[PDB]
Design an enzyme around this catalytic site. Structure first.
Site, PDB file in Angstrom:
ATOM      1  CB  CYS A 189      -0.816   0.098   1.294  1.00 23.05           C
ATOM      2  SG  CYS A 189      -2.364  -1.139   1.092  1.00 23.05           S
ATOM      3  CG  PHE A 239      -7.921  -3.973   0.135  1.00 19.76           C
ATOM      4  CD1 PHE A 239      -6.949  -2.931  -0.007  1.00 19.76           C
ATOM      5  CD2 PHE A 239      -7.828  -4.861   1.232  1.00 19.76           C
ATOM      6  CE1 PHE A 239      -5.708  -2.973   0.761  1.00 19.76           C
ATOM      7  CE2 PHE A 239      -6.813  -4.658   2.071  1.00 19.76           C
ATOM      8  CZ  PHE A 239      -5.590  -3.807   1.675  1.00 19.76           C
ATOM      9  CG  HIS A 285      -2.627   4.679   2.444  1.00 26.22           C
ATOM     10  ND1 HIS A 285      -2.572   3.170   3.320  1.00 26.22           N
ATOM     11  CD2 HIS A 285      -3.013   4.329   1.379  1.00 26.22           C
ATOM     12  CE1 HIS A 285      -3.343   2.375   2.707  1.00 26.22           C
ATOM     13  NE2 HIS A 285      -3.535   2.723   1.239  1.00 26.22           N
ATOM     14  CG  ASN A 341      -6.409   0.741   1.046  1.00 27.40           C
ATOM     15  OD1 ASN A 341      -5.819   1.325   0.167  1.00 27.40           O
ATOM     16  ND2 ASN A 341      -6.008  -0.086   2.238  1.00 27.40           N
TER      17      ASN A 341
END
Lengths: 385, 385
Positions: A160, A211, A299, A332
């Protein structure tokens, strides 16, 4: 001391263009528990379904774009199971989708940039959605008709933090080569991570709640021709760090059944311990002491990390607004997420009419993380609108 | 024009140290057909065994180091089959072996370099032997106690050209950051490619005859402190190219059963067509017209390519001597092979007592290739002994 300019560039690497792209097919978060437990032939796990509903709500996500439709999951049942042999099928899907998604973001970033694509000399391509030989970097070069002599860096399965890594790499590419123009593309999807539920594993259910799929593309270059190119950000510093006492915090085993995560350590507490001195180190050559005098890109892989960090630095709630938007609207998207957030921040600044691409502030920090435990940190300077 | 030196380096990137390492266990080529067909429970394929014997002889290889012992293949039968689910086992073996092999080459290159390892600021790590999260770059940083804030670039599954890619990356790392010292490590093994035979597939048997295990490590840096560091080579240019009309020449599908190659196009004829003008382009700023006035490193992934190239450029047979040695003594060690050849060339120059690390010649070319079809080309300048 001075050196002959020669083949090298004079000034810092600059972000000159950015765009994003997502698969057409999306899922609203409020319908996902029903969709997820239906198509994974798993409605019987009623208590787990209730647990997932609770997790999905607490992710503050609203929608997620996903290559994986019901029909494609029907034509590939092994992907829907918790743990069945399915790597070749996932990778066949990566080959049909990941370079193409990258090309859609790239076309829009090149259109904004306004220069011919034969001026692109370097490609940095990050993905954790499928290991391909030749890589998605190759496939994109062909689909876009880029110069066959482009210098490519293909980064598979960093995880990531690779949106930071892409900027860190692009920085040295552009600064050391005069005229160099660097297409940066992170194209991500859950193609390796998607699987059915199991009561034995809950560190897999949390991953199914967050995700999603998306690609970001940037043009990065130094020495901008200020009459044909309009810089958006400058990349002033870019560093990587392994956090102390973090061994095996995030582990991803790539198996016959795809990518399987393992999350034993407390990721929030690790970030919370270390973030301040890392960011203080990044800000050190700016003389900025006020935390709310800079714009922010974090993030958003764990929403709680955003909240705990907002509290610790006593940030104005408006600071993480671009970050929380991308989270809610896209989820994400692996390494791409921080570049989506950069773009939303640029767009929200021009929409709300502020003095700088960085929301009126002058400096800004980009902070991404993943296996290691690894943190990538980029120091950004905005430009005046 | 001139620019302020600031945080950047003055001169070209230099190779300052190099060492290699291999697993203890090796196999002589003349015993391999018997060993291979025995342990893959495959002695019955008698005609294929005869075909393999012929292929193994024509590879001009003498030995190959291999992590895979009879005992380890016994404790993991799926790896020995032609096509059985085995990715997790291969990757468990990559985690126990690939960072460790890299650390053995690194320790020797650091020992030659003679500087403290806290002066290492960047790591470039290439491997096609196992996708790990966190990567072999991480594992090596821990095993070596490198600074936790080292800047790492982890390159998974580029394939055979990545030794060139590692040099191309290290070049911009070192030149753009003053003081930067770059540990370069290619650690390779057949852990993903090894499998049993099948009469249906012969593009898999040729691969079993050549690929082997090994790691090379370099220190790369600009602005050498000439009283503590002794440059070995300079990295003057480094370029990548997709060869025209080469779509799908080399394809590697990573599956449940590991890495499976597919080689439809004529790789020799592709290289033979294009090598001259590529190398002419590399040599252009040197004013060298004589092909035998420069030293040579060619990735030896196909022995016939060496011969056909030797003929086309009418090279003195002595030119490809370092290259043919590594081939015979170690086989194709994926991206590491061209760095082994660089090292053997440096060692053969000092042994035979010639004027330059490049065998007396001043310039030299490094040429590697793999999926794309991709060619990496590095222009090297020797140093005086």
């Amino acid at each position: 001391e001075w050196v002959r300019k020669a083949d090298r560039a004079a000034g810092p690497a600059a972000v000159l263009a950015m765009a994003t792209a997502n698969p057409s097919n999306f899922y609203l978060q409020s319908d996902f528990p029903d969709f997820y437990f239906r198509v994974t032939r798993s409605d019987h796990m009623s208590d787990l379904k209730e647990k997932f509903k609770r997790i999905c709500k607490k992710t503050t996500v609203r929608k997620r774009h996903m290559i994986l439709t019901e029909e494609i999951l029907n034509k590939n049942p092994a992907i829907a199971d918790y743990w069945s042999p399915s790597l070749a099928a996932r990778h066949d899907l990566a080959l049909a989708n990941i370079p193409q998604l990258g090309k859609e973001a790239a076309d829009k970033a090149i259109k904004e940039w306004g220069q011919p694509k034969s001026k692109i000399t370097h490609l940095v391509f990050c993905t954790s959605a499928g290991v391909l030989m030749p890589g998605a970097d190759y496939q994109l070069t062909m689909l876009l008709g880029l110069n066959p002599s482009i210098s490519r860096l293909m980064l598979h399965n960093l995880g990531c933090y690779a949106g930071g890594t892409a900027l860190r790499v692009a920085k040295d590419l552009a600064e050391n080569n005069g005229g160099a123009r660097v297409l940066v593309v992170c194209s991500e999807a859950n193609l390796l991570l998607f699987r059915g539920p199991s009561e034995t594993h809950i560190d897999a259910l949390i991953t199914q709640s967050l995700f999603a799929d998306g690609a970001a593309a940037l043009i990065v270059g130094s020495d901008p021709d200020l009459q044909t190119e309009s810089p958006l950000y400058e990349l002033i510093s870019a560093s990587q760090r392994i956090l102390p006492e973090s061994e095996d915090a995030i582990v991803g085993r790539l198996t016959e059944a795809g990518l399987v995560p393992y999350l034993p350590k407390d990721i929030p507490k690790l970030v919370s311990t270390n973030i301040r001195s890392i960011l203080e180190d990044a800000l050190a050559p700016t003389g900025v002491q006020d935390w709310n005098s800079i714009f922010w890109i974090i993030h958003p892989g764990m929403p709680a990390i955003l909240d705990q960090t907002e509290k610790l630095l006593q940030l104005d709630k408006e600071k993480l607004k671009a970050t929380r938007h991308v989270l809610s609207e896209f989820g994400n998207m692996f390494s791409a997420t921080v570049l989506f957030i950069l773009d939303q921040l640029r767009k929200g600044a021009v929409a709300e009419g502020k003095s700088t691409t960085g929301e009126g502030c002058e400096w800004g920090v980009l902070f991404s993380f993943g296996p290691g435990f690894t943190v990538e940190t980029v120091l950004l300077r905005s430009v005046a609108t």
